[PDB]
Structure formats: structure tokens, C-alpha cells
Design a protein around this ligand. Structure first.
Ligand SMILES: [Zn+2]
Ligand SMILES: [Zn+2]
Ligand SMILES: [Zn+2]
Ligand SMILES: [Zn+2]
Lengths: 354, 350
């Protein structure tokens, strides 16, 4: 029965035992390194609002005991006999999923993140324990080749917040030099969205409800224009100018002004999840043939491509590195967005054997 | 202008149509002049004639979907000879020198010239003679009937364009059509010819029988039954939604596979309530679409001819036009009125 006795590789980390979401030391086990597997010592594990939501069981479908960790990097300790991509001592990353059915339309076409049988790394779809623990093991297919010129501690949120912004920027053709790209909201998702857009060669506009952020965007993100969305004169002046908009705002807001900012054939991408639904008048879409698209996560192909891109363009996240016994306080901070902009748990140095 | 013409026009916002004399330009070097044989009409003309939106230039000659026969041509005209058949859709000019123009989507130009005069100072094709720049004239194939083909230049292009733009034109795909009206019935016909397994989505049980029996539609979902809608969750590559009435699209997004596309073609007054999770779970999109470009329109006409696609139409004499307008209001026509200008437009008495 007991998780530590199931498999032969003994592991330890931190787990939520109930819907209170309190993380505490947890012993468990993982499979032996099979022929196609990559075992690794976890060095850093990102976290974010998704883990707050899951750990407190916001959707009523969490399986306790729950071990977070959908954005992890570490150092390879063992490789199976048929592994190509890694040798022992190489760095590796694991994102949101570790498996899929490998046979459906989605899998066959390299978009296996959309597999109805996708296997979440943290085991919210399936039975699995996430990488906030000492040792991880993963099928080669689902392991990111992590280059030595991409810092681990500040790179790790690319596997969560990064791919989320990068994927739609490529999918909707918002990655060409000289395009005008808007980002709404300068937080976890938006800050990386800006760094990607800049690297693609876009003229970047920050759209925001707070003037505080204007100076930040200009000084620290090289942002070209700032639009305060509560200022209609400012907003109206940029009508029909943006090729696309990455909307990261989690608060209730209207997207009709955002649709109006787009050129004809332009794209609104929604990445935040307000509790308030959006009100979308048919005419706002039909005038100029505009689209609104949602996006979460990305494929393995897209995730490797992004990490390669980030390494080459020196793109990392703003992070606060924390010891693992700070996890429960970090969750409180995530609740209040009191982090600039992502927590990264230093597992390598601060997780000790029980 | 010197070319002496006559047609029908509305004078005030009553929307009443009567004989109206006017004139067009002589044929320039890039121009095609034709005798009008058929003139499509639709809800757009009802709205513009009654000044729904408040920016209608009177007197208003309708006719944004017309066909006929070439009478004369300009010096530098390549695409037409005299006696050929020809069509004109919803715009006759654009600025030519902008981004939207250079890339072949001039319908998105902000200085775009409407055939009916609405963006511009023009008179539409509900009249004896037309003249248009050759770029904005469609080459009409001999095996496409004129009377039943003319509404393609409006309803046809409107359904065809997004089917192409959003990759919903591949054989084998599961394509939903919501609403079986004017747009709906041509959307079904195009999707069938592309090779798709078509599902009709409708609020009306009457439409189930119509879809199977008359369009060879595979599947039907009633959108007021949650149990039937639940059973098709995550099965469709795209939906073409033509419904003009207030309705939720949260169920429609739910019908889409991951990476699936919802195309809005109707224009309800009620806005759509769209929860973020409905777009985000599956990475789905909602896009608007009306009309299309000249390249696409010509291409759509060749495809319609090649695959025996026409609209269902009621051909009407011109003195029925005012009655036709109450019937367009009541949604009482299967599925588009086509005015027999060629046989029924009389020349005004001297
Ligand atoms: Zn995360
Ligand atoms: Zn699969
Ligand atoms: Zn029409
Ligand atoms: Zn133009």
C-alpha cells in the first residue's frame, strides 16, 4: 500500500495531505530507470498559482497525497540503455506532462499536450508525484535538453509561464520582426511575453490598469509604448494599430477595447482566467475579422524549441529563490501576487533527507 | 455621368422601393459594362434601406450581388470579351496602395468602396446597366446558373472564406454548422464538397429533418438538449455559426476538439458571454468573418461551378421587391430572393 514501498527508487519531498494545502515532508518511491528513462537529481522546482489551486483542491478533483512540481530542472544521474539525448551530468527539464497515449491524432501530430490521455507530471490527470522531491525519472521523450548557457534557477519557470506565452506567439504568427505586439498585464506571464516579443523583434506595447507599471515597463523591459486601459483618449489613439495582444490579466476586465486596438486580421490571445466571463459583441469580432484565442501550456516540440530560443537570446524569468521549508509561506504570497514574479524552490540545497 | 441608366431605389427610411433614374460613367480602359440579368438581395438590404444603423445615403439603390452579360469593354481589359457573363460582389474599389490591399485582402481596407454606396458615393446593381473596374468583376463559368448562383457573391463567399482561412476545407474533418438559413445552407454545401463529415446544430427539431433529407447531413445536435450536446463534446474541428439570435457559444466551444475553431457569421444584439476556461481548456479560438477578397471570390465561384453548388432561391419580379423586404424581416424565404431584372425591370415611360 504505502507509497515508499511501491517502487524500488526511494524518494522524498513535500506533499499536501488534504485540502488545507499544507505541504509537509513526504516519503514515496519512483520506478527504476528503464531503458528509455532519464533519472535526475532535482535542483530547482518552480511553482505558481496552479499549485495553490490544486493543493487547496479548488476544483474538487485533487488526489491526496499531492506532490507539486510541473516545472523542474536538475542534473542527470542515470540514463537507460537506449537513451540518445542525455548523458550522466547533463542538465534536464521537465514540464507539465510526462506521458500521453502516443497513438491518437494529437500525439501523432506532435501536439500531445492535447491528448485526452495526457499524463500530468504532478498527477492531477493520472497517478504520479510531481518533481518537488530529491529524485525524478521521466521517459526521454518528455525530457527537455537543457543547455549550459540557460541558468537553471531563473530558467525553470520557462517550462510553465514561458511556454504559455511562447506557444501562441509562434502559432498565431506574432513572432515576426517589426510587428506591433501588445501585452496586457505585467506579471508572471506578461514579463516573459515581453522578453520573447522583444527577442522576436516586435514593437511592444504594455497595456495596464496601473500607471506605476509604466516606468517599470520602460526602464526594465525596454517597452516602446504604454497604454493605460482606464484612459479612453490614450486607448482610442492606438485603435487599429496592434497585430496582436497577449492578455495576461487575471482580474475582471473588458476585451472590447483590446479588440478595437487590433488591426484587421489581428489576434487577441487570452492567458489569464478571470472569474468574470468576457462579454464579446459579435460586431467587435466581425469588424476586421479578428480572433480571440485561449492558450495554455504547449507541446514537447514547442517546449524544446522555446528553451533553445531562450538560451540563445539570454531570456530568463524574474524569480525569488526560496528554501523548501518556505513553501507554505510562498503559497500565501502567491494568493496575494506578492512575488516578483515567480517562486523557485532550491531543492538541491535545501531539501534534506528525513 | 453620360451612361443613361434606371433602376429601383429607396427615398427615405420607410425602405419603400420605386423606379429611380440615374447614370454611370462611360467605360474607362480598365472597365466592364454589362446588362444586369439577376440581382440578389438579403437582410443587409432590408437593414440599409430602413436605416437601421443611421448612416444610409439616400436615394439608395440596392444591389451588391449581381450578374449579367458584357455589353462593352475598355482598351486594356484582359479578363472579358463582349457577350460573356460576369458578376459583381459587395465592393467595386479600394485604396490599392495599403497593407490589406497589397496582400490581397482589400475587403479589410478602411477606404473600401461598397457597390451599393454606403462606404462611398455609389449606386448598386438593381438597375438595367452596370459598369465596374475589371479587377472587381468575377469571370462567370458557363455551367454555373446565374439565377441560383448570384447569391454566392454574398452568402457564398461569407461561408467559403473562413472555411479556407481556418483550414476547415480538408477531407475527413468534423465541421459543425449552427443554423440552417441562408448562410447555413451554403456552408453545408461547401463543407460537403471539401469532404467533411457535417453536423447541423440547431434550436429547431424541424431543421433536423430538413438537414438529413435535403442536405445529406450526418449528425444533428439540438442545442436546447444538454444530454445530446454532452455526447458530442470534443468531436468537431470547426464550427461555422450562422445563428442571428441571442445564444450561448459556451456549448459550441465545448463541441470543439483541442485547437478547434468557432467562426461567428451571425450578428446577435446580445453579446456572447465567454468564460476564459471555455477558450483555455483546449486552446480554442473564436473568430469573426464577413465577406472576403476578390481572389477568394473568383476561386469560390470556380469551386462552386466545379462541384455543382448553387443557392436555393426564390426568383421574383421587381414589383415584388417591397413584399420581399417584409419576408426577409420574417425569415420566410428559401433561402435568398433573386430579382429577375432582365425580364421584369421595365424602362420608364416618356
Ligand atoms: Zn507553474
Ligand atoms: Zn494521444
Ligand atoms: Zn447580400
Ligand atoms: Zn487599401
Amino acid at each position: 500500500k504505502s507509497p515508499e514501498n511501491v517502487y524500488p527508487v526511494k524518494t522524498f519531498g513535500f506533499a499536501a495531505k488534504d485540502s488545507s494545502g499544507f505541504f509537509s515532508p513526504f516519503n514515496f518511491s519512483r520506478r527504476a530507470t528503464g531503458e528509455n528513462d532519464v533519472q535526475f537529481k532535482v535542483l530547482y522546482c518552480g511553482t505558481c498559482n496552479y499549485d495553490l489551486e490544486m493543493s487547496t483542491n479548488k476544483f474538487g478533483m485533487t488526489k491526496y497525497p499531492f506532490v507539486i512540481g510541473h516545472e523542474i530542472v536538475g542534473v542527470v544521474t542515470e540514463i537507460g540503455s537506449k537513451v540518445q539525448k542525455f548523458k550522466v551530468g547533463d542538465k534536464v527539464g521537465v514540464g507539465g506532462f510526462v506521458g500521453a497515449c502516443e497513438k491518437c491524432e494529437m500525439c501523432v501530430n506532435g501536439v500531445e499536450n492535447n491528448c485526452s490521455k495526457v499524463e500530468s507530471t504532478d498527477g492531477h490527470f493520472g497517478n504520479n508525484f510531481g518533481g518537488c522531491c530529491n529524485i525524478m525519472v521521466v521517459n526521454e521523450k518528455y525530457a527537455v535538453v537543457w543547455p549550459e548557457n540557460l541558468p537553471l534557477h531563473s530558467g525553470v519557470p520557462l517550462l510553465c509561464a514561458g511556454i504559455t506565452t511562447y506557444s501562441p506567439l509562434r502559432r498565431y504568427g506574432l513572432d515576426k520582426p517589426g510587428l506591433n505586439i501588445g501585452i496586457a498585464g505585467l506579471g508572471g506571464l506578461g514579463h516573459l511575453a515581453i522578453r520573447f516579443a522583444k527577442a522576436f523583434g516586435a514593437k511592444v506595447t504594455l497595456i495596464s490598469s496601473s500607471v506605476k507599471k509604466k516606468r517599470e515597463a520602460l526602464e526594465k523591459f525596454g517597452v516602446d509604448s504604454f497604454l493605460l486601459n482606464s484612459n479612453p483618449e490614450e486607448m482610442q489613439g492606438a485603435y487599429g494599430t496592434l497585430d496582436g495582444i497577449i492578455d495576461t490579466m487575471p482580474v475582471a476586465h473588458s476585451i472590447v477595447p483590446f479588440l478595437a486596438l487590433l488591426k484587421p486580421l489581428g489576434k487577441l490571445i487570452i492567458l489569464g482566467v478571470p472569474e468574470e466571463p468576457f462579454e464579446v459583441p459579435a460586431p467587435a469580432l466581425l469588424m476586421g475579422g479578428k480572433l480571440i484565442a485561449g492558450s495554455a501550456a504547449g507541446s514537447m516540440k514547442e517546449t524544446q524549441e522555446m528553451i533553445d530560443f531562450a538560451a540563445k537570446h539570454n531570456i530568463v524569468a524574474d524569480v525569488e529563490v526560496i528554501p523548501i521549508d518556505y513553501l507554505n509561506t510562498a503559497m500565501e504570497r502567491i494568493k496575494n501576487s506578492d512575488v516578483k514574479y515567480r517562486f523557485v524552490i532550491d531543492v538541491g540545497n535545501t531539501l534534506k533527507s528525513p
